[PDB]
Amino acid sequence: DPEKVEMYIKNLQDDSGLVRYFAADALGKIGDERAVEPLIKALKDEDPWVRREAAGALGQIGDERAVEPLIKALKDEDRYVRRIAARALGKIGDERAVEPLIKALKDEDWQVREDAAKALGQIGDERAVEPLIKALKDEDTTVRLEAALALGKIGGERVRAAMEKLAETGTGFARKVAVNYLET
Amino acid sequence: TDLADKYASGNSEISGQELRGLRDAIGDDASPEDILALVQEKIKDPALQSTALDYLVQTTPPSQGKLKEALIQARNTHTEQFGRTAIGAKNILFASQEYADQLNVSPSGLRSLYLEVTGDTHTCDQLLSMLQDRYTYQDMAIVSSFLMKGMATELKVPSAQLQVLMTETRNLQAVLTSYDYFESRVPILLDSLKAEGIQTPSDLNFVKVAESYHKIINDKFPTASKVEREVRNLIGDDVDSVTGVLNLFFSALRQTSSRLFSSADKRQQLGAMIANALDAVNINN
Amino acid sequence: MREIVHIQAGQCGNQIGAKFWEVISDEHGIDPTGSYHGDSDLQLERINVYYNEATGNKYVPRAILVDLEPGTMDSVRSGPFGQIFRPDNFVFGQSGAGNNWAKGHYTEGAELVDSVLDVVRKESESCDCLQGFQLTHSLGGGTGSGMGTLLISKIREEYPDRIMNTFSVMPSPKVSDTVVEPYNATLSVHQLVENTDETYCIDNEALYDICFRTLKLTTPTYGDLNHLVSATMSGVTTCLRFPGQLNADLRKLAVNMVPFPRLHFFMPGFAPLTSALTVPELTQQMFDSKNMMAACDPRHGRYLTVAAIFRGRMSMKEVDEQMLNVQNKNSSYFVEWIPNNVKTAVCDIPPRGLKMSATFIGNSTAIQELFKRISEQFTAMFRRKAFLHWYTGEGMDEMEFTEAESNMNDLVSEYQQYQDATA
Amino acid sequence: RECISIHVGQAGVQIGNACWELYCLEHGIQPDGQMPSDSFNTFFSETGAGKHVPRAVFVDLEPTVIDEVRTGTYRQLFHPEQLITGKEDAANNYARGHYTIGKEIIDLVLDRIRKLADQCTGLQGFLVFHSFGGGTGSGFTSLLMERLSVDYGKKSKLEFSIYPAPQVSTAVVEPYNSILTTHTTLEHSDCAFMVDNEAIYDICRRNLDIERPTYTNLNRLISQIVSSITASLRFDGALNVDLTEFQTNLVPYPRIHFPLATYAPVISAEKAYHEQLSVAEITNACFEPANQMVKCDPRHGKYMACCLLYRGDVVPKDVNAAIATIKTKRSIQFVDWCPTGFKVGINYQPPTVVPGGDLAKVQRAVCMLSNTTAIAEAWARLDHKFDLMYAKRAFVHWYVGEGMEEGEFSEAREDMAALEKDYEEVGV
Ligand SMILES: Nc1nc2c(ncn2[C@@H]2O[C@H](COP(=O)(O)OP(=O)(O)OP(=O)(O)O)[C@@H](O)[C@H]2O)c(=O)[nH]1
Ligand SMILES: Nc1nc2c(ncn2[C@@H]2O[C@H](COP(=O)(O)OP(=O)(O)OP(=O)(O)O)[C@@H](O)[C@H]2O)c(=O)[nH]1
Ligand SMILES: [Mg+2]
Ligand SMILES: [Mg+2]
């Protein structure tokens, strides 16, 4: 309803974090465009539950306005805010997010690196081919698995050339990915 | 037990017997004059007479409107006659009897003394001199406690006057406490001097020592020279004797009641004075 | 419910108070410089109760040191842990009441009190949540008794919502030769019965008797008595300083120990006195008349409430069993009309030198024996109207002697009524 | 569909921790709210980011207990505003929890509950966890129950009360707090599940073989029984699918709303290998007073209601067969104006155990809920201890000092005397 949306938009200013975090979650679920500028303001909330919910909400709406503010949320102090901002950027599918997500592939937290790889696969920009190839050598097995899956969504000549090189000079998992995905 | 026994209870000066004897002696048609005559016959003490009259007015039912009014008028007349002599002494009856027992004296005598003391403006010194002429030092302190009990109980009366008299009596008590300090410590000092072969004035006692101490503290403008001078005049010129007493006076100063000092400064000034005197009588170690 | 403000008044207060600091500081691993050099994280768990943290993590006692006698400043400072105390927290006078209660309560003491209250105020502000106050003093003197009970009343008017708990040293002829002590003890008991929430009765008669009879010390000194006081104080404050369920704060202990507001005088006990002891031997000794710090026979009354504190590494199955036996075997000495009145507490950190110890806190109707002893000593003097002018001279009046006498005899009668109270 | 849980005081907060630890395991939610991937949504709100947040509020007048939740493993499970604390506790004094201290925090707690209620599409009611003996558990709970009755009128309020037991009991005054809270909560609770610490302590010692059980040992046992009671609300169920279904199936007389919970099997982790117990065996154990969580004898009273809540590998025919045996063998006398039947529920979700935990994993379990007049035995124990102390007016001054008039004590006792007479009157 148009009223439920304005009510929740008003709740994004409430003193109570319980009210703000709920309002951001609710606005994401409603998906009304009117909530995009107030949700962008919520990405700067003191409470990390509200920031996380706002990032998630913005990804669910899918509006381009959220791209530059979500790119700055990839540098958030909170690992769950970062991981959700990466998820959201992949959901939106905007090319502007490719270079910041390539940097997030090198995050200290593996759930952020994993969501960055998934997002890069979702976006499907060729600039992600070489960084995702490097992520096949990540210490985390699930990050390596998502980087191989992501390259599978990209495909093409950059993918073929990178696989031909890895099947020749690469070792372990990356070598196996290059031989197996080359057959596919 | 009746009102007469309630009145006689704790009252070492009246029996329920004499009170009943008095009430029974007073007829219903007894004029205020008749009542007083009877009260006066059986009871010589105005305090006890007034006490008896309270008993009489109080033991009389309002049914005997004429008698109670006559008794009331008699008591009013007796109170008009004696005023404080009856009422004041009556007020402190317990106190006078309690201390009369401790002193093994007459309670009436103490009540008379009390009224005497409280009948006019008296300074501590006036009180001290007034008591030393009547009591042993031992007994004086006890007497002072009777007067204090009596005055405190007079919260029922020369209000303003008693307040001043109480301040003066407290001063008196503070002085006596000081004399007690010297009483116990002077022999020790004299014995210690004697033990070291130091001959001291044969008559030297705590009073003379204490009196010298008080002349010093009450001195209008005391000096270390005046202090040493008084001490030398007191115990002589033996360095250890003078030192001993000055040390005793210095020790005494810390123990003397604050009320005996014109200010906090006065106590410190005296200490400095005594310390300076002790230094003067220590040059030749 | 966190910080406690400690105050020590007079010679006895400062002597017993300094041994208390020496003892708990060593228990919590603090050296006289206020630096923590401990062994367990439990030592610092409830450290904020008695200590304030300085920059450099220098733990300083929340202690106010008072005496009208200036000499006590030096006695404290020259002591073992004398350095640890805050220099601003030393409130000292120019005199020393000389065993006169009126001097400490009305004259010299009432002059210094405002300066003390200023120090109590500043220590109470740097308190997140103040529990209450704890005073160490002797009832026999002039400063500890008179000024101490003036302070109690003055603190109660300023902090009415806070617990006021004291360690009051009862005078004894066997220890102090001063005549007027029954006056100062009777005039103080009168205040304590109306202004404190819980009072630990450290009786110098019991302390002398323990050193003389049990420890075999033929000529006991204050040092020997104080060794017993420090151990008792260390044990009765164990539930306060270390983590726990039972009697954790002054009010939780008050609500469990005080059935009637005036009946708040405790008989402290401690085992073992001398320095291979089992839980049954510890339970047996801790209840024993021979080990009580107040000269009362427990068999002369009944216990209204009891708090038993076991320290060390021992079986909790054994302690629960031994405490239950000590009650079902001695049923008649415990008040029938207060169910489950004996609450037991276990602390794994034992006191220095012992591998196992037990501290007892009893609210026994047999404490009336202690007050009766003081009333008998008092009556005999007040009968002759002895030394009255020393007190009346300082401003007070005879009625306050008669009021103190009546109040203490009413307290003894009150204990007796609950001793005889049939369920 | 939603239920809001309120955890009051130490016993409530610490039981809630054991409960939520179990609910999380039962539904496969990690302590960060994430679930590696709808029934359990009645207890957990769901966020787009992945989080499942307990619909719970934790209140204590002192911070120390909740501060441990705030810094614990479950610190990210709850939003901080769901964890509320004061500065000074109730010092085991009902009057402090109800009047003095409680009055300060009540308004905040209520607003936080309202914020939770506003995130509900159809709030069923409240589940309240607290002790009887504590000042906050007794005093603050009754204050809150009074205020919830106003704010959420026609909404069910179900309790989980910790009946005091000398073994663990930290206060002499616990009998007073128990009678006082139960008097003021009586007309504001719709159903109350009492948990007698002596019973749970005895089960830990006998069955779980823990010589000196800690509150942690007890709580894991309480939370198994709590989980069994609330399983119907968290899983697609047939019996007690509603908070209202609890009253309708267990509370025929409304003051008499204290059902006796019995759980079987409670096997030690140490015991396995052992032969797994059948539907017949676990049902038989429900009629053994050793397995009751309130110490009393149903063989001394009469039943008003009886619910059998099975969990695990249990087949309907086996349950019918097991019930049939119990009807013919046991003395299950029902009150003269009631149904002779046993309401049955089966949840095919196996019982969940806490990894490590003193309790062993079982193939099948049962929690029987009975409304027996025998529960008045537990009221009588409490009432006697109250009577002994009140006659001498012992400790009463503590309460009067904290905004409570002495008359409230007598009034409370009079309501207890009436409750005892009510259980007597049912017995005909
Ligand atoms: N156990 C114990 N009792 C003490 C100690 N010092 C003095 N006492 C006792 O304390 C009582 C006298 O009180 P004091 O502390 O000396 O007096 P005060 O409070 O300092 O007051 P002033 O005399 O004016 O200095 C007597 O009963 C002494 O036996 C001590 O170190 N330990
Ligand atoms: N089973 C169980 N009982 C508990 C627990 N914690 C405390 N209790 C019991 O609860 C009673 C004491 O009440 P508490 O709830 O702890 O105290 P509170 O609610 O915080 O109240 P105050 O601390 O007095 O303000 C006693 O009967 C304890 O045995 C727990 O973890 N488990
Ligand atoms: Mg001294
Ligand atoms: Mg608590």
JSON list of N, CA and C and ligand atoms in Angstrom, two decimals, chain D residues 10 60 62 65 89, ligand 4:
[
{"chain": "D", "resi": 10, "resn": "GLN", "atom": "N", "xyz": [17.12, -12.95, 36.93]},
{"chain": "D", "resi": 10, "resn": "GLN", "atom": "CA", "xyz": [18.16, -13.94, 36.67]},
{"chain": "D", "resi": 10, "resn": "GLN", "atom": "C", "xyz": [17.63, -15.30, 36.22]},
{"chain": "D", "resi": 60, "resn": "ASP", "atom": "N", "xyz": [16.09, -7.32, 33.50]},
{"chain": "D", "resi": 60, "resn": "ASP", "atom": "CA", "xyz": [16.65, -7.53, 34.85]},
{"chain": "D", "resi": 60, "resn": "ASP", "atom": "C", "xyz": [16.96, -6.17, 35.46]},
{"chain": "D", "resi": 62, "resn": "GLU", "atom": "N", "xyz": [19.27, -5.40, 37.51]},
{"chain": "D", "resi": 62, "resn": "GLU", "atom": "CA", "xyz": [20.74, -5.38, 37.69]},
{"chain": "D", "resi": 62, "resn": "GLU", "atom": "C", "xyz": [21.36, -5.81, 36.36]},
{"chain": "D", "resi": 65, "resn": "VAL", "atom": "N", "xyz": [23.65, -10.05, 34.79]},
{"chain": "D", "resi": 65, "resn": "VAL", "atom": "CA", "xyz": [23.24, -11.27, 34.09]},
{"chain": "D", "resi": 65, "resn": "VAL", "atom": "C", "xyz": [23.08, -11.09, 32.58]},
{"chain": "D", "resi": 89, "resn": "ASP", "atom": "N", "xyz": [19.58, -4.05, 41.86]},
{"chain": "D", "resi": 89, "resn": "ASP", "atom": "CA", "xyz": [18.61, -5.16, 41.91]},
{"chain": "D", "resi": 89, "resn": "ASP", "atom": "C", "xyz": [17.54, -4.97, 43.03]},
{"chain": "E", "resi": 4, "resn": "MG", "atom": "MG", "xyz": [19.78, -10.79, 40.07]}
]
